[PDB]
Point group: C3
Chain length 243, copies 3
C-alpha cells in the first residue's frame, strides 16, 4: 500500500511535535487494520423515541433510588441485545478460513468511551440477561474505570457488537468503523424534534439518528436495512421486547 | 494488507460455525476487491416523487392488463438511462493502463436482488431503448430467475451502472459499494412525506432518498452533484425525458 | 492489493477510449493513496445560517465597492480558521514515524476548484489573519488562476485543512476524501429552508449541510462532533469570532 510522501511542514510556518499515547497508536493500528480489511457500508435510519424519552424521564425517581442515572444507553443496549438474538448474522464473525461464519450464542456488547489517553471499548457481558437498571449501573462503572485507567484488559474482550454514542456532543449522523472481527457497530447521534407526517399533518416527534456500519462481506444491504428498521420499531415501543 | 488477529471465540460463550455459500464467498471477494481499489465518495440527494407516485398509481390498470406490476424501479431505470447518455463519464470505465477511460456507447444497467444464497445483479440490456412496461416485465422476470437459481451467468454481465433499491425495507440513506469496473451505483431508500418550503409555507411532498457512490478517480465531486441534481429533476417531472 | 479483472467491454456494445489529462491521473493517484492510508469517518451536522445569509446579502454594496463578490466561502474560511486554532489536533499531521503528530502553528486552508483538466486545490495562507473581503478577493483570484492554468504549484502547497463546497450544484451531504497528510476536509452542500423546532412550533430556518471527513487515527469521534458542533455555533453567530 503506497505510503504518503513526507512533506517538510516547517517550510510553511512554525510546527511543534506532540507525541502519541501508546493507546492512540494501538487505536490507530486497529482502525487501519479494520479499514483495509472490511468493505464498509453505512445504513442510516432514525427512530421515534418520544415515548422512550418520556419513559426515561418518568423513571428518574426509581433510577436515583437505585444510584444509577437512567440514560438512553441501557435502553439501546437492551434493544440491540434482543435484536442480535433475532438476526444472528449480526452477532457473528467471519472464520479465518474466509468460508464460514462463527455464530456466537452469547451477546456481549461494548461501547465507546473516549478518554484522555484514547478510545476504550469496555464490554458488558450477556446484555440479554440484564435489566435496564443493572445495565445502567455497569455501563457507568466501566466508564469511570475506563477514564481512570483502572479497566483491566479482560473487560475489553470478546464483544459481539459495538455501540458508539455521540448524542451527547451533537451531529446528525456519522459513518463509524467496524471493530473487526465484529461485523457491525451502531453509531447514535443527537436527537431532535422533527415533523413527521401523521397521514394528515406534521406532528413533532423526537427522533434519534442511527448509523449502522457493517461488513458488507457478511451482511448484505437488505439484512442491514431490516436490522435498523426493526431497531427503529423496538425503540419506538420497547414493550415489544416483552413478547 | 495486515490481517485481522484470530480470536478464540468460544472462550466467551457457545459458538456455532455456519458455512458460507459459494455465492457469498464470491460476493465477499468482489466487494473487497472493489473497496481496496476504488476511492469511494457518496453523494446524497432526495427527489420529489409526489407526481411520479400519482403517475405510477394511476397506471395500475394498464400495468395489470399487461401482466407487469409497475414499481418505481422501471421509472428509476429509464431516468438513469437518459442521464447516463447525457453525462457519459458515468457510463464508462477506467482502462487497465490507468490512463484512459473506456466510454461505453451502450446502456445496460443491473440491479441488486438479494436472494437466499447471496446478492445477484441481473443486467437489463439497452435500457435506453425499452419502455416503462417492457422494463417492468423484464426486471420482474430476471428477479424470479435470480431467486430460483435459473439466471444463466450471461445475464450478470457487462453492465454499465447498478441501482440497489432498499426502499422496500426501510432506511434513510446508505453508502453502497461500486461494482468495479463500473464507476457509480445508485442506492435508493424509503420515500417519506417531508415538508418542503414553497417560498411561503411548508408543503408535504413525497421525497425519495438517493445515495450515489462513485469512483472518485474518474468522477469528481461537482460531476456527481450535477448527476443527482439532474436525476432529482428528472424524477420530479419524467416528461423531461420526452424532449 | 488484488487488481480488478480486465473485462473486454466491446463484447457488449460500441466503446470509445477517451484519455485522461495528466491532472486527472495525478488526482487519481493521490486519492487512492489517501483512501488506502486513512481510515475515514464522516461526521454530518447542519448549521443555521439564516442570519449569516442576511449579513452576506446586506453587505453586497460594500463588497461591490471593493470589487469582490461576498460568498459563503470567505465566511466558511474565517470560522474554520478560528476553530482550527481552538482545536489544534485538526490543524496537524501524523509524523512519518506514526508515533507523533506535527501540530502546525499556522493556518493555511485550500479549497477545491473543479476545472476542465481536473481538481485543483489552491491554498490561502494565514487565513486567520485576513478579513472577509481580503479572503473574498484572494479566493476569487486563485480560482480564476486555477481555471486558466496560471496557478503556479507554489500555491498548491502546505495547506492544513481543505473545504470542498458543492453548495452551488446541489446535494444534501457527501463523504469527501481527506487529502493526506492533512487530517480533515469539510464538505459543504446546498442550503435549504428547513423547519426547526423552537420549543413550541416549527420555524423555517435556512440550514447549511456540512460533512466533515477525518482521519480516525488522529481524530476520534467525540473530537469531530465537537468540531462540527462548534462550527455550527460559529456560523449561526459569526460575532462569536470577535471575542
Amino acid at each position: 500500500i503506497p505510503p504518503i510522501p513526507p512533506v517538510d511542514f516547517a517550510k510553511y510556518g512554525e510546527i511543534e511535535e506532540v507525541p502519541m499515547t501508546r493507546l492512540m497508536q494501538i487505536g490507530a493500528t486497529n482502525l487501519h487494520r479494520s479499514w483495509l480489511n472490511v468493505p464498509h457500508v453505512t445504513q442510516f435510519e432514525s427512530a421515534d423515541i418520544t415515548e422512550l424519552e418520556a419513559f426515561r424521564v418518568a423513571q428518574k425517581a426509581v433510577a436515583k433510588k437505585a444510584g444509577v442515572k437512567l440514560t438512553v444507553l441501557p435502553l439501546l443496549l437492551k434493544a440491540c441485545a434482543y435484536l442480535l438474538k433475532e438476526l444472528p448474522d449480526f452477532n457473528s464473525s467471519l472464520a479465518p478460513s474466509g468460508q464460514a461464519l462463527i455464530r456466537k450464542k452469547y451477546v456481549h456488547i461494548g461501547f465507546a468511551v473516549d478518554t484522555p489517553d484514547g478510545l476504550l471499548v469496555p464490554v458488558i457481558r450477556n446484555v440479554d440477561q440484564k435489566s435496564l437498571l443493572q445495565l445502567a449501573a455497569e455501563a457507568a462503572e466501566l466508564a469511570e474505570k475506563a477514564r481512570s485507567k483502572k479497566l483491566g484488559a479482560d473487560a475489553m474482550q470478546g464483544a459481539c457488537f459495538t455501540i458508539s454514542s455521540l448524542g451527547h456532543i451533537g451531529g446528525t449522523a456519522f459513518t463509524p468503523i467496524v471493530n473487526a472481527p465484529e461485523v457491525a457497530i451502531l453509531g447514535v447521534s443527537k436527537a431532535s424534534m422533527q415533523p413527521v407526517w401523521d397521514g394528515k399533518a406534521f406532528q413533532p416527534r423526537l427522533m434519534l439518528p442511527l448509523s449502522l456500519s457493517y461488513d458488507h462481506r457478511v451482511i448484505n444491504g437488505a439484512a442491514a436495512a431490516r436490522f435498523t428498521k426493526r431497531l427503529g420499531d423496538l425503540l419506538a415501543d420497547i414493550r415489544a421486547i416483552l413478547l
